Design a protein around this ligand. Structure first.
Ligand SMILES: *Cc1c(COP(=O)(O)O)cnc(C)c1O
Ligand SMILES: *Cc1c(COP(=O)(O)O)cnc(C)c1O
Lengths: 451, 453
């Protein structure tokens, strides 16, 4: 009958406890503008996550809306199968290739990040069969990495919450350590030496598995959903040397880091990664349309092209691959990010965010503050010396996130860390408000944990 | 540089020979209106495939475009994670549940058909773990079925072109026969007996694999990409009895059949299927937005809900799941289909299409004319008695499709069959034009072959 009642009756929600949902119902979000969303009671919230790490231009960018309209009225749907094409897919693909931080050869479009990583898995398998290396198939990823939730991409993902009860990972999807100094460094170990030990771990993993069986290493430049985990200094340098030593492809999952999130246009620039393949989504279209993109370099394309010829055609593609409305919106989105100098602006807003949060560095429940550019997290602990949680891992984060919402801010808990990933258009005072609302939530949480 | 040159330079095309693409370049489609698209030279074509079996309302429905606008200007993106919701997802889900041809409990949204089928795989695995049946995991599908192209959903798919080179199918993804009488029936075998033999095949497959290890059977009510293959009479009845005997879930992949394609609202109605899970996409939004929907019945939901509680939350969801613009467009799309009586209209347009094509039933190159509702195919052969192809399999289909395009019509060849899946809004005279353009293409193809006889 009521709208909340209909939701409970008819929707199975993602990333939601279904039974609790039947009791509590939804928080229905009705409208958005700038960095704000409003619920159906008219309460406004700063969307400090940009939705799902994604709405770079906020929730009422008229240029994107008009670009959708203009394309809708020209050609509202067509496809790229069997030599068919259309201008928006062509022009977007050109723009993505030309702005890539390393030389890239081709773009392949999907709807989601998960589909894109799933497609990259198939591409690498197809590639290595093309080349006559049928054993070179295994993927290496990392504990706490997030790469999506198809059967294959959830296998790449290294978060237990995405695997438990789903019979994952599949075989051939291997995991090395999470590069988080605060949690996994040895006592008195430096960042650089933590990085050394991670590179050794990767090489030993490869040697134990048989280097000839390892096709690819995939990683987010910095880990998003897994906690805003910034890798230790020299990690990417040392990891890439191990990969290049055994002819292992380096895949940068830029689904969150892409398009100005980390202080430069790509996480690959910020962290000195020269990937063979890049995966892009989210900020690509400010999530105004579902779209993702895979960039592959020359060797990857040439092997695939050779096979697609021998086997008649590339037996892969989604109905929505390169959708003309989604590609048109993404094209306009990238033009706005360039014309408005949002990469530079976000970097400056990020410095303000990070300096604001650092006033709480000696709070008794603050275990670590981390991030770079305009992405950050504050990890809470029940005890700073031991780094132990209050009650059980997740208890603090759950409480903090709930308090932040009460104070008009949407953040996301990742265990006991709360994340910040605001729209790139956030202004200085809005950053101040984000920090103030974080502060109030923290104060509430501290009184709740109590003496 | 020119637009075709940019395409060749920068895009890897799906379902395209990449090397041939570098030589020929693209056919760039510039605009659409009604049932027509126009290329960049201004030549018009009837889109007899509705794009990819999908654009129910044609290529310039203003109501859908305005519904997108109105939602863009309210809330252009949000998500459904962690109890968050929004009106368009809620109202769409209600509408889908209430119109379902069997009692259904919940809707889960994805972007694509492939994602939806991939998600259904995970849901079934999660479900059976929830129920304490950890061995009950394998899926059974069919030769020539199409269910998408993720690693898992390409394993469900039974077309060799989707598996060759990709190390698929994964283990646990099993295949029984294509239910196409014309190609796989024994000499002088009836439809009903062909159906018996297929049901026996399925039961033997289950028994050989261990019934306790089989979770689900999935099928398109009629097979789309694999050839517009109408199953033989009594197939679905007998297949479901085998499934119910061993407590195997029945999943109807309605990605093509959904929303009026086959003569009734759902392929499940047309063919008497009582599925536990339905998968919907394509006509859902006339492909104006990427969206797919999974309908799950009460037992499937209850088990999933039970576990999500014990494990804290359901560890699954796409950023675009239930996207407010895509759901708003699909909602308006389903309203138009109902208000304009397009299911009934498509049924009538389909009988005209079929009657038109049947004037060529005794043509020496026409092996079979099949379909129902407003989906059809004409399978061409080089020799009717042997059913053998002219030159290689595919030669006639490729030539026919090329001639159809020259005559202003886009059809898709599936080997030597050419498909018809026009927008539901096609009128009687447009059906006449589709059949005329098919006839000219067939006339060209006949002159090219020279059947003599
Ligand atoms: C969100 C995300 C994905 C998956 O994207 P979907 O569109 O939600 O499937 C993949 N990789 C990373 C790093 C992500 O953050
Ligand atoms: C087209 C199709 C799919 C896959 O849809 P995408 O949106 O292209 O992933 C799945 N099943 C059937 C029956 C289809 O026709």
């Amino acid at each position: 009958s009521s709208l909340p009642e209909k939701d409970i009756q008819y929707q199975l929600h993602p990333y939601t406890n279904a039974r609790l949902h039947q009791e509590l119902g939804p928080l229905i979000i009705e409208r958005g503008e700038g960095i704000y969303v409003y619920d159906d009671q008219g309460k406004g919230y700063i969307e400090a996550m940009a939705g799902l790490w994604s709405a770079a231009l906020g929730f009422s960018n008229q240029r994107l809306i008009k670009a959708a309209e203009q394309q809708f009225n020209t050609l509202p749907f067509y496809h790229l199968f069997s030599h068919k094409s259309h201008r928006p897919s062509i022009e977007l693909a050109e723009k993505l290739i030309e702005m890539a931080p390393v030389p890239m050869s081709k773009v392949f479009f999907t709807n989601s990040g998960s589909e894109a990583n799933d497609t990259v898995v198939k591409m690498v398998w197809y590639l290595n069969n093309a080349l006559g290396k049928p054993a070179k198939k295994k993927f290496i990823s990392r504990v706490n990495g997030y790469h999506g939730i198809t059967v294959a991409s959830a296998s790449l993902t290294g978060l237990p919450g995405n695997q438990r009860g789903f019979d994952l990972p599949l075989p051939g999807f291997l995991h090395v350590g999470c590069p988080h100094h605060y949690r996994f460094a040895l006592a008195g170990e430096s960042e650089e030496h933590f990085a050394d030990r991670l590179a050794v771990e990767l090489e030993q993993k490869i040697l134990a598995e048989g280097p000839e069986t390892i096709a690819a290493f995939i990683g987010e430049p910095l880990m998003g959903a897994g906690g805003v985990i910034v890798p230790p200094r020299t990690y990417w340098e040392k990891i890439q040397k191990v990969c290049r030593k055994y002819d292992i492809l380096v895949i940068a999952d830029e689904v969150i880091c892409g398009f100005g999130r980390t202080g430069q246009m790509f996480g690959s620039q910020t962290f000195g990664i020269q990937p063979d393949i890049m995966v892009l989504s989210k900020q690509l279209s400010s999530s105004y349309q579902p779209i993702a993109a895979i960039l592959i370099n020359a060797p990857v394309f040439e092997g695939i092209a050779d096979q697609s010829q021998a086997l008649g055609a590339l037996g892969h593609g989604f109905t929505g691959s390169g959708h003309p409305v989604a590609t048109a919106v993404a094209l306009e989105n990238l033009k706005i990010i360039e014309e408005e100098s949002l990469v530079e602006h976000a970097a400056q807003m990020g410095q303000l965010l990070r300096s604001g949060l650092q006033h709480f560095i000696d709070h008794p429940l603050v275990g670590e503050i981390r991030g770079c550019g305009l992405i950050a997290a504050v990890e809470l602990v029940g005890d700073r010396v031991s780094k132990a949680p209050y009650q059980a891992l997740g208890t603090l984060g759950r409480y903090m996130a709930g308090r932040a919402q009460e104070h008009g801010m949407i953040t996301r808990a990742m265990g006991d860390a709360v994340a910040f990933c605001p729209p790139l258009i956030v202004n200085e005072q809005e950053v101040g408000m984000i920090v103030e609302r974080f502060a109030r939530a923290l104060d509430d949480t501290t009184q709740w944990v109590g003496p």
